[PDB]
Design a protein around this nucleic acid. Structure first.
Lengths: 224, 88, 129
RNA sequence: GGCGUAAAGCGCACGCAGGCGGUUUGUUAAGUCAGAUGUGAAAUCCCCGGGCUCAACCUGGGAACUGCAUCUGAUACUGGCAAGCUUGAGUCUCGUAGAGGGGGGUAGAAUUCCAGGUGUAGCGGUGAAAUGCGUAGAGAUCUGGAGGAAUACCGGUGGCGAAGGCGGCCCCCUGGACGAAGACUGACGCUCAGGUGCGAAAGCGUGGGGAGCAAACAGGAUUAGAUACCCUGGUAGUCCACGCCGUAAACGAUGUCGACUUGGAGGUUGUGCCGGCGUGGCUUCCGGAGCUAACGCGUUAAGUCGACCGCCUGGGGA
């Protein structure tokens, strides 16, 4: 990754000067049409060192959680984690997925038995009506836990999209000292993230750019 | 207020050039002239309290300037209050 | 009106450290320069400098070690409303010794340590920690 | 230790005494600091020992007696003195906005009354009524006049003023605030007990005025009762001039002044540059750190400091 691709994909394209966060004055050069421009020289080294940390944590067989819920990137993030051998959460986050893992573990156990009931012929011995509720449980729990069914232990690091949108997940991960990575707009906060990476995450191009670069570095780290 | 010509006249008569307005002598002369003018205004307008407050402000500012001059130079203070008939 | 420039300087230092300001620029005085000397020679701030002939300006570069501010508690002790003087026998110890009490003595503005070693009392300018 | 809401910021201001005081140099050494000398009685207290078989107790020596005076030094800070400096404060030039104040005049809308024209059995009021007004002609409607008070729209959590407060329009007299460039003085400052002044409405004194409104009062209702609520009237008073009173939930329940400390959504008035880029003031709302008991405050602080003032110390009594 480098400055030219970031400017091509609108990484510098942040939010309005009215939505600017008080804590992101350094990460911005100036203004144009009342839209703040995320500094692109401050982005490359910080993004690259966050990528290098992701690569290093990929050597220790360390798990990574990809977090992003908005509809613009749901398929993009759900693929960027599916082709990374790492778990994700891309739909409506259940608060307490990390701090209260001792109940959603029972939830995913019920989900696993209900989804082995999918390939079991179970939805044939019931009177064509309970199958509706079981299939709806399948649907809702797959939406809620679409990547962490085989998670098998709290994730080691948290790579997130739109840090402000996922502040519940961010603060949960902070509550246990888990390294947290944020694709964070100017309108969002760096206080809950130990690795702040200023960069747009509404531009689907920028989301794909960050996801692809981090996938490349994490796959490189996990190769060895 | 004092007309522009009156202000210029007092500054020239009390300043040590055509452009010396901030000196204590010029300031006290201006304050005294304004008070002497305002006495006639408040003879007719004993109920003009809002302007009398500003007149008393001028009085107090002049008193402080005279006290400052007196501790600064007795000779200029005596000359100044002689040139005006100021009681003290 | 402005009546305690020394406490004003301590307040500017404290506010900058609470605001995470990099440096603070203020009108310069010889006593302010002396307290900045004492603070720099004890590591509480990074460095100082002065700009200006008729109106010198004192700019102190603050330091922060682990994100957090270096100076924890900096407090005016002897004030215009109440001047505080100590003989060498009864000089204070800030933080049981970990901080300093900036004591102007007859041999210059120094810490409580240097004043105690030199066998001198003096006015207790400020506590730093 | 406190003072937004628990008790607590004087209603506001000016100001003497007092308290405090931007920056530079020299000097002094008063405060400050060092050392000494003298004194600080003994005892007591404390420490190290001694004697009563121990202890209490007695006892040797020391320390302490935190103080005062004198002397000799030191000069960083405060003070005195002398000279500077301009950034606090202030004066001058031009310009800006304003219901800032005093006095005088004028205008239109509306109410009441008086006169008249047209016209006839109602009007008015209420939850429903009645009191009341009207056949002596009301109400309605049209015209003329008298008079008093208040100034629709504009009008804006707009503006100005220390606060109280200030609202049609014009004029005369007049206070303050602010801004752009400069010019000038050179700490002349801040706060302020006592003191002085101002200070809503009601009220008081003297003399005017009196439309509307309306304490008191009267009547009609309501009601168990109704010295009220509602209705019909209606006098002080509200208006004016002068004097007095000196109090309001006189409130931001938040003293003044100065310095410093993330942001954002709106409105307002100057000045620079080509509707945009700035620069000074003000104002409304949310909100971060911080603070708070919380509510909340939050660059217009209730955050971090400094100067000074005022005030509080359980409830009642009071």
């Amino acid at each position: 990754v480098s400055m030219r691709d970031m400017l091509k994909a609108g990484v510098h394209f942040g939010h309005q000067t009215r939505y600017w966060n008080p804590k992101m004055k350094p990460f911005i050069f100036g203004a144009r049409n009342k839209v703040h421009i995320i500094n692109l020289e401050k982005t490359v080294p910080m993004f690259n060192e966050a990528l290098a940390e992701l690569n290093k944590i990929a050597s220790r067989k360390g798990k990574i959680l990809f977090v992003g819920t908005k509809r613009a990137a749901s398929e993009a993030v759900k693929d960027a984690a599916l082709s990374c051998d790492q778990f994700f959460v891309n739909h409506r986050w259940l608060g307490g997925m990390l701090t209260n893992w001792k109940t959603v573990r029972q939830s995913i156990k019920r989900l696993k038995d209900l989804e082995t009931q999918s390939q079991d012929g179970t939805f044939d011995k019931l009177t064509k009506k309970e199958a509706l509720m079981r299939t709806r449980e399948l649907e809702k729990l797959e939406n809620s836990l679409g990547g962490i069914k085989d998670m098998g232990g709290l994730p080691d690091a948290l790579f997130v999209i739109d840090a402000d949108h996922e502040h519940i997940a961010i603060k949960e991960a902070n509550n246990l000292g888990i390294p947290v990575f944020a694709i964070v707009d100017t309108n969002s906060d760096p206080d809950g993230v130990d690795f702040v990476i200023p960069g747009n995450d509404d531009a689907i191009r920028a989301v794909t750019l960050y996801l692809g670069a981090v996938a490349a570095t994490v796959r490189e780290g996990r190769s060895q | 207020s004092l007309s522009t010509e009156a202000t210029a006249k007092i500054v020239s008569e009390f300043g040590r050039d055509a452009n010396d307005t901030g000196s204590t002598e010029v300031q006290v002369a201006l304050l005294t002239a304004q008070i002497n003018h305002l006495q006639g205004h408040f003879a007719e307008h004993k109920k003009d309290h809002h302007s009398r407050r500003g007149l008393l402000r001028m009085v107090s500012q002049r008193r402080k300037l005279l006290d400052y001059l007196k501790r600064k130079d007795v000779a200029r203070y005596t000359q100044l209050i002689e040139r005006l008939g100021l009681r003290r | 009106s402005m009546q305690d420039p020394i406490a004003d300087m301590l307040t500017r230092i404290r506010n900058g450290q609470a605001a995470n300001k990099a440096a603070v620029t203020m009108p310069s005085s010889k006593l302010k320069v002396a307290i900045a000397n004492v603070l720099k020679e004890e590591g509480f701030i990074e460095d100082f400098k002065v700009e200006g002939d008729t109106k010198p300006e004192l700019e102190l570069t603050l330091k922060y070690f682990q994100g957090k501010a270096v100076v924890e508690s900096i407090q005016r002790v002897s004030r215009p409303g109440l001047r505080i003087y100590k003989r060498k026998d009864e000089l204070p110890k800030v933080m049981a010794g970990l901080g300093i009490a900036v004591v102007s003595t007859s041999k210059g503005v120094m810490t409580d340590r240097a004043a105690r070693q030199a066998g001198l009392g003096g006015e207790i300018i400020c506590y730093v920690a």
